[PDB]
Amino acid sequence: LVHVASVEKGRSYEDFQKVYNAIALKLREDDEYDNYIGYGPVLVRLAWHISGTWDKHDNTGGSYGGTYRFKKEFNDPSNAGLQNGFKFLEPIHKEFPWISSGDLFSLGGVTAVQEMQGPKIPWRCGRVDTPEDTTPDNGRLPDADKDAGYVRTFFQRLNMNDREVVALMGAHALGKTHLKNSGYEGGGANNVFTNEFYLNLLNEDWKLEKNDANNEQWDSKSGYMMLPTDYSLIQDPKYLSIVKEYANDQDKFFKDFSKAFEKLLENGITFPKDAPSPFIFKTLEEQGL
Ligand code: HEM
Ligand SMILES: Oc1cccc(F)c1O
Ligand SMILES: Oc1cccc(F)c1O
Prior knowledge:
The protein is mainly alpha-helical. The chain has 14 helices and seven strands. It has helices spanning 13-29, 33-36, 40-51, 71-74, 83-95, 101-115, 148-156, 162-169, 179-182, 196-203, 228-235, 237-247, 250-266, 284-287; strands at residues 3-4, 175-177, 186-190, 206-210, 216-220, 225-226, 269-270. β4 and β5 (216-220) form a beta hairpin. Bound molecules: protoporphyrin IX containing FE and 3-fluorobenzene-1,2-diol (3FA) (2 copies).
């Protein structure tokens, strides 16, 4: 199964920068959401969940087809709460109806990372909407009540290695868990992208507690939280090495996250040899906007 990127007709960097800017301006405007976290973190999760359905074995799922717009996928229990991201993006979809759904969802994640002072994430256009019958079934996204071996095996399906897994999980320094969505509660409630996930793992005093949904989670003296799968990154010696690396080198972490996140968002997509080079969007701050 081949999905060839096809540039939206006549569109170029300037067009997508406009879309980026509209998302970024709305991120700034809609500041109240989730107790003033704003929509950045949920947009990042949305980009990841639309991409994370991919299966390297048969090229099913993946960001290309924009299939989250269909009920089977938007009602996946694994996707509970992402409807907030979808609603945020609705007015952008309306202003720019030419951008494909996969392009929009993934560009929402790029924009969020950047505007939250994260690394630049190069991004390619050309995802093409595919029909409802191409929507992947529920159950391809990961469980949180599992161990390091589960995580490692899980991410092999997405063609991610240990370094890529550990880098991607640094996004758990964004936002929070919400009991009603996932059965976990708490987190940093951060909206600025840092390597704090790694520092907190190493430096906080963690206790394994049960939350109000009767699930186990790791809670810190100082008010942070880690899922069992997060904490597994310091229980496995290979992951622990990499955690320490990223805790001690912000720039390395940013660079590795950027590569892994772009890869995640592009899995399944064949880019023609004469496709445009990836775009690197300027932040509103860089533009003086
Ligand atoms: C083993 C893999 C992972 C598991 C089990 C996992 C699980 C979870 C869960 C249970 C939540 C809370 C959802 C809620 O209650 O609202 C969450 C939130 C989040 N996840 Fe993950 N996740 C994983 C990997 C990733 C990756 C790879 C990224 C992106 C690179 C990501 C980004 C996020 C973000 C940004 C949030 C916060 C959303 C918000 O504040 O609304 N996660 N994740
Ligand atoms: O209908 C939509 C709303 C938000 C984002 C999209 F990509 C849509 O197709
Ligand atoms: O463990 C977490 C997962 C997602 C977001 C957070 F803030 C967390 O502490």
